[PDB]
Design a protein around this ligand. Sequence first.
Ligand SMILES: NC(=O)c1ccc[n+]([C@@H]2O[C@H](COP(=O)([O-])OP(=O)(O)OC[C@H]3O[C@@H](n4cnc5c(N)ncnc54)[C@H](OP(=O)(O)O)[C@@H]3O)[C@@H](O)[C@H]2O)c1
Ligand SMILES: NC(=O)c1ccc[n+]([C@@H]2O[C@H](COP(=O)([O-])OP(=O)(O)OC[C@H]3O[C@@H](n4cnc5c(N)ncnc54)[C@H](OP(=O)(O)O)[C@@H]3O)[C@@H](O)[C@H]2O)c1
Ligand SMILES: NC(=O)c1ccc[n+]([C@@H]2O[C@H](COP(=O)([O-])OP(=O)(O)OC[C@H]3O[C@@H](n4cnc5c(N)ncnc54)[C@H](OP(=O)(O)O)[C@@H]3O)[C@@H](O)[C@H]2O)c1
Ligand SMILES: NC(=O)c1ccc[n+]([C@@H]2O[C@H](COP(=O)([O-])OP(=O)(O)OC[C@H]3O[C@@H](n4cnc5c(N)ncnc54)[C@H](OP(=O)(O)O)[C@@H]3O)[C@@H](O)[C@H]2O)c1
Ligand SMILES: COc1ccc(CSc2cc(N)nc(N)n2)cc1
Ligand SMILES: COc1ccc(CSc2cc(N)nc(N)n2)cc1
Ligand SMILES: COc1ccc(CSc2cc(N)nc(N)n2)cc1
Ligand SMILES: COc1ccc(CSc2cc(N)nc(N)n2)cc1
Lengths: 248, 249, 249, 248
Amino acid sequence: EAPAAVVTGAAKRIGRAIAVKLHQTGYRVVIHYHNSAEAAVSLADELNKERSNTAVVCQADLTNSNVLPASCEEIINSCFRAFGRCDVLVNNASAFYPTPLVGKTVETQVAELIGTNAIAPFLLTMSFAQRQNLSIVNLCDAMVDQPCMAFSLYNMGKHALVGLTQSAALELAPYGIRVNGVAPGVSLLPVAMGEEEKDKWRRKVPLGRREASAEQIADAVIFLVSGSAQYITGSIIKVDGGLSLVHA
Amino acid sequence: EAPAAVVTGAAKRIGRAIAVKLHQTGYRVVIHYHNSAEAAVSLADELNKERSNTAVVCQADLTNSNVLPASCEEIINSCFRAFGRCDVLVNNASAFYPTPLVGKTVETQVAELIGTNAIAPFLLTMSFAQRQSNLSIVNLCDAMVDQPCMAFSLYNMGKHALVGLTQSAALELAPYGIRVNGVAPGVSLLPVAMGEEEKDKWRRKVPLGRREASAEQIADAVIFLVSGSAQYITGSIIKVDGGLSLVHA
Amino acid sequence: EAPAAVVTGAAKRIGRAIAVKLHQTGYRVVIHYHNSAEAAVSLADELNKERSNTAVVCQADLTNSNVLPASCEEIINSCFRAFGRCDVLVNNASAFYPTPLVGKTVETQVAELIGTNAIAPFLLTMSFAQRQSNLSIVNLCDAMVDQPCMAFSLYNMGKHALVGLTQSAALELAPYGIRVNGVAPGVSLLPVAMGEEEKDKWRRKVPLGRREASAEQIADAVIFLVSGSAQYITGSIIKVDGGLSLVHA
Amino acid sequence: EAPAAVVTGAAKRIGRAIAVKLHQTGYRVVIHYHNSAEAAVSLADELNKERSNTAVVCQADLTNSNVLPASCEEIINSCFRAFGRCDVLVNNASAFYPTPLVGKTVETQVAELIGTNAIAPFLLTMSFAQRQNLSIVNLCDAMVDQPCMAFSLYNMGKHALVGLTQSAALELAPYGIRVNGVAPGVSLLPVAMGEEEKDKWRRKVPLGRREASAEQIADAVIFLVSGSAQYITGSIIKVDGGLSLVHA
Ligand SMILES: NC(=O)c1ccc[n+]([C@@H]2O[C@H](COP(=O)([O-])OP(=O)(O)OC[C@H]3O[C@@H](n4cnc5c(N)ncnc54)[C@H](OP(=O)(O)O)[C@@H]3O)[C@@H](O)[C@H]2O)c1
Ligand SMILES: NC(=O)c1ccc[n+]([C@@H]2O[C@H](COP(=O)([O-])OP(=O)(O)OC[C@H]3O[C@@H](n4cnc5c(N)ncnc54)[C@H](OP(=O)(O)O)[C@@H]3O)[C@@H](O)[C@H]2O)c1
Ligand SMILES: NC(=O)c1ccc[n+]([C@@H]2O[C@H](COP(=O)([O-])OP(=O)(O)OC[C@H]3O[C@@H](n4cnc5c(N)ncnc54)[C@H](OP(=O)(O)O)[C@@H]3O)[C@@H](O)[C@H]2O)c1
Ligand SMILES: NC(=O)c1ccc[n+]([C@@H]2O[C@H](COP(=O)([O-])OP(=O)(O)OC[C@H]3O[C@@H](n4cnc5c(N)ncnc54)[C@H](OP(=O)(O)O)[C@@H]3O)[C@@H](O)[C@H]2O)c1
Ligand SMILES: COc1ccc(CSc2cc(N)nc(N)n2)cc1
Ligand SMILES: COc1ccc(CSc2cc(N)nc(N)n2)cc1
Ligand SMILES: COc1ccc(CSc2cc(N)nc(N)n2)cc1
Ligand SMILES: COc1ccc(CSc2cc(N)nc(N)n2)cc1
């Protein structure tokens, strides 16, 4: 039987590309979502039209709370429910917005940014491991050491996620579970963002003066979960077209 | 007027060393504590006997909660209440224990490990800036963050977040003249519950001396980072590990 | 038409697995060697037996000297002479031996270690770029560069230099469509000379499988980096170390 | 009796600041120079005026060659002959210039950039140790991982120096010798650089929109060689005003 993968925030953009490429490679997928029900099912329909009963959806808020552990336990369960196995976990879901040091309460910002980018990936990892070419891939950020201004919580989240990638690689290696990361720089920009401000970020990218397509990010994910990366663990692959190498 | 510092978890060990050294340097100190009331009060006694009206104690739980912001805001408030100013903040307080991936609830482990090592520093940092000359923050990090102990995922994630904060905070608060730096022990004072055999196993790994760092040795680097000799230093983590992080498996 | 690749030190061990896998992927290969004449010619034969006119050998000493630029210019020239193009450069050749601080002269050690591991890669990158599709360079680095073996400073200085090259070359050659990246083994193929308890000592330390990387596992990452699945990857060093660099002392 | 320091390229700018602060701390100093004999001599006189017989100068080209090892052995030897001891070694001398990938020969650029920045520090280290609060301090570069364009050989030099620092810390720790680095970001700008170009770099620095004075860099070196840094080794202290944290 075909292996099975969980992709968090898989309904749109980069997570959608991961789930599609994983499916095109022959995985059965769990498309997690929070708000994008319509887009998630739409993706599942497309994938299932290709091969019947190879894509299911799963809803969960990934914000930190007393219920988070149980939601993450159940995302992993849905993969075992649908497919009888869970070979791959891609922690892609992420909140990202500014939290100046000098309207959500700060405690809610903590809950969303630290929960989605860090704690939920920790809890999903716990449940993944407990339930067992098994690997985990975490969507990190190649700009962590040169962070966006006023983004300290988000940024604290992605650093926490780098530490979890490393800790979990060390601890889960005895179980044959590899744990790795993929770090975009500028991939798909928010439709929210202004076009002028978009081309400002694009022009900074040495390799082609453009952003990464979502497929380019998914390519790194595909490599990491493959047989070609079977000695690779605790590694984080930058996919940033040299953006992080560029001084101020 | 003498400047004033806040040191979190300052009742004993390394935070005591920081507070004492900051006090010997001429600072007034808020000794923040959680459970260690007698040790906190004993230390504020010692320091006030040295210079009257120069040490207070301040109780707070730094576990993450929806009341954490308020608690951190009050820690900073207490320094202004006592001393009319707050020049320096040392984020020393830290919970530290295993959380294996395979009777505390996981929700509580998240709250204590992430709260003490990362969210309280963020919140204290926020409160410190908004209440505002040589202003600086020093975060107690960990030199072994990239070669972590087995099954310390949460603690390690919180120390990594602390590195992230140090950097983001240094960047954002530089315009306000606040510097933000770190001090990363490898092995310093070992746990009180640890047995001497297990301590010596760690001691024997340190290239420089085959011994742990003293609390004064850690405190020395913090005192450098707050001084006028570090006036251009920000976003920097100073490793104080006797070469331990260079030693391969 | 088939693209072509240069692999330094490709007669044996890891560079040989690299050249074999490039060739299976469809590349024509220049097999560079220094002393391993017999092995190099044997490899070209096997590759050519499989697909005709797809492999040449090229001899060069990559020790630093005033003629090293010319030699490196000639290794790149040999690919154009043989195949009409040069698409891929792999910097694999490396001297590796201890150089304690406290019968080769120090002048020679500096020359072999820094030349093979850094200066030759720099000069090759220069000639490659100047002679100029999916063009890319992969340098063979070392995952233990921050946790070096004792008394291996010149070697370690060379590997660090190689990281600096990867990044500086990635930045500068980006506007030319040339990507530059790295593959950093931990313990892979273990030395001929090394005793057998030393090998098992190193093997026990590897979290993932308690074994060293096969030559082919290292080559897989090189192959990924030069493929059309890495078109946005530049200035990245991929560890292929079974988690070894994560194990504390 | 008073301890003694060797400082390389100590005649001008940053190295001169380091020599002076060491001397003010109570060190006797070997002022090394290559071309700047008048400034070296000028410093030694100033310093000997303060304290009789506490400053000497010592000339040596630090470009890589087959005589380099002998030259570095003689710099160390000069401190022993003059003062009877060599407690501190500061590796400050640095060639710095572009070497684009696409009127010196390239082999000479290699020899100057790699020799001054990396090989001479390694030979000076060998000799320092062989001859024995003992410490070495290397002048590194905060911008090593975000290099200036077309500075690959310089950048290769500074990276090697980080590795030396680490390798030397580990190997000389049993002899009680600590090895550390100080990494400037933007410090003293070349005097002949136009103020308008100087200002483009200044403006990039978060902490105060200015470059570090030489004395500011010297301050960190002073720290590292003091009794206040006695457990510190293998460490590189950035002195950069937050410059390296600033994204493109
Ligand atoms: N795009 C870039 O340039 C870039 C750069 C650096 C790093 N990254 C990383 O790459 C990954 C994917 O990036 P992206 O731009 O595709 O992400 P994105 O659009 O910002 O977010 C992806 C998904 O995360 C889910 N999500 C947000 N908040 C959630 C919550 N509270 N609970 C559960 N799910 C939640 C959302 O799902 P729903 O719509 O279903 O609610 C969203 O569609 C992220 O980890 C990101 O941090 C991206
Ligand atoms: N010791 C080392 O070898 C070492 C190594 C690497 C890094 N570090 C770092 O250096 C720092 C100092 O080390 P240390 O060993 O002296 O620390 P520690 O004794 O383990 O902890 C210091 C203090 O943190 C406070 N704390 C714990 N949980 C708290 C909570 N929920 N709320 C508020 N305060 C809490 C405790 O205060 P109360 O007693 O008053 O309850 C404790 O006295 C820490 O940041 C540590 O991570 C130390
Ligand atoms: N093997 C590992 O565990 C390991 C670990 C970390 C990093 N690496 C890196 O991965 C690469 C491959 O490893 P490996 O073990 O296969 O390497 P290796 O066997 O030690 O050396 C590869 C080739 O380098 C060539 N070489 C040595 N000195 C030379 C010189 N002066 N001039 C020109 N060529 C010279 C030799 O060619 P000839 O035989 O023709 O003389 C040799 O076959 C190296 O870059 C190494 O640094 C390997
Ligand atoms: N200034 C900065 O913004 C900055 C930034 C980053 C890092 N740094 C680091 O801090 C250190 C000092 O910087 P700096 O600007 O003061 O230095 P600098 O002016 O560029 O040079 C320092 C001295 O190096 C000596 N030197 C140059 N080539 C030499 C050679 N072939 N042999 C022997 N000595 C040679 C020169 O001595 P003579 O004049 O006597 O010939 C020169 O005065 C360097 O290691 C540098 O890389 C500085
Ligand atoms: C720095 O300017 C940018 C670049 C990319 C984006 C894409 S939205 C996004 C980005 C991210 N790093 N994480 C998450 N979750 N979502 C937004 C602003
Ligand atoms: C590696 O084995 C050790 C070494 C030192 C200690 C000291 S207790 C401690 C340590 C820490 N990194 N953070 C906090 N908060 N407390 C415990 C276990
Ligand atoms: C002391 O531990 C080891 C580990 C691997 C080896 C393989 S031989 C080798 C290694 C290398 N880093 N570079 C080169 N060129 N060849 C030898 C000793
Ligand atoms: C921002 O562009 C600059 C900044 C400072 C300088 C001072 S000269 C210098 C610089 C250096 N890193 N190393 C050495 N040896 N010399 C020149 C250009």
